[PDB]
Design a protein around this ligand. Sequence first.
Ligand SMILES: *[C@@H]1O[C@H](CO)[C@@H](O)[C@H](O)[C@H]1NC(C)=O
Lengths: 50, 50
Amino acid sequence: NIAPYKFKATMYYKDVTVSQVWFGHRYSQFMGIFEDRAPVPFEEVIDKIN
Amino acid sequence: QLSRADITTVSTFIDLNITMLEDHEFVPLEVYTRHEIKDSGLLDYTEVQR
Ligand SMILES: *[C@@H]1O[C@H](CO)[C@@H](O)[C@H](O)[C@H]1NC(C)=O
């Protein structure tokens, strides 16, 4: 048997994204963007999502 | 007058039975199809990137 064991699963995460913006006299620019996948706790996955 | 089959007959010939080789049909057979081999990998860069 070479076929990998396949099973269904559900992912839970929050795309935390905090960006720094510089406002010029006539333009806007992104001085930095930080993207992170924050996990969801068991309490929220059970008592809030499910 | 008597029929030809009324007298006992002995075969003076040395019989040789010849059984021709029966036709055989070969069906396709593969241990692992190309799809199975591709699926053997745990991860696929194409699907992951898509
Ligand atoms: C086949 O050969 C045998 C001898 O080996 C003979 O006795 C027989 O009559 C032949 N034919 C058949 C239909 O068996």
